[PDB]
Write a protein that binds this DNA or RNA. Sequence first.
DNA 1: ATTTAGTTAGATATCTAACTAAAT
DNA 2: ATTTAGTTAGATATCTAACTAAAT
Lengths: 137, 138
Amino acid sequence: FTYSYLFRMISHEMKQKADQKLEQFDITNEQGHTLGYLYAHQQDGLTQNDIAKALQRTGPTVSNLLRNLERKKLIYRYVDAQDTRRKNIGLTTSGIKLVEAFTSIFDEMEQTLVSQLSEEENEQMKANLTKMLSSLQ
Amino acid sequence: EFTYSYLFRMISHEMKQKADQKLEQFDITNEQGHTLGYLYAHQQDGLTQNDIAKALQRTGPTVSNLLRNLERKKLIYRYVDAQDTRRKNIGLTTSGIKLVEAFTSIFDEMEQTLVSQLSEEENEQMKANLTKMLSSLQ
DNA sequence: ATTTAGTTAGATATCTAACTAAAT
DNA sequence: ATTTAGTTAGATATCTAACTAAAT
């Protein structure tokens, strides 16, 4: 089996399983992780470009994702007072409640995954993944 | 220190991007490349649209759209089976075959520059563990 | 004059639900 | 009456290119 096949499938399947679980929250996988990131780093408090950089997503992409979240009233955006170009992002109380609500799912997946592999194997695995991801700049 | 989902997502994304970049000169996408590849390797079996759906782990509509794209590209031909006309058969065109023969080198070159760093033992171990994980999610 | 942050437009990949055509 | 094999419709995610607006 080629590597591309492997990764593209374990990630297609991961995305699918995640969406299946998140169906009761009316958000997608990507929105779930974005919401989570915002949960972690809200206090910073980051612009859209920061999210783009942190997530490996282009500007228009995150613009659409964020406009989606904002339509679901899970986040809020305002213009920075110092740099009118910038758009500062924050979680609303609904967004925060939601993040506190699904987050168990992601952890469930991570656990159900690591339970397949012995800790030495899991550690060597993550190390080799990190190295591979490093290879592609 | 990194969630598995993060690593897999990111890796798949960078692979898809580099692939798309190198494939731009052929005016196809990563997915089209792999589809044409699968056609190349299993054309002989009379691949129905849904057999491709099963093999690529994509859904019927998805496959329909990608195939329709490739057909618009004239890289593939479509016809209706004689034994069962609710089903239609898929085939590589000569343009398509030449294309596959042309770009396969990219997927190989990438798979290569990826495998090389990891020692062949670590490589075997990794493809094995990866297979185990994908097995689990399936 | 350039550089940077965000939005728009056009175009693929992908999913589920609904639908048409046709084997059983 | 019931399944299968593709298509259509409507949706989200993503990227490139061209855009407006705003900072050097």
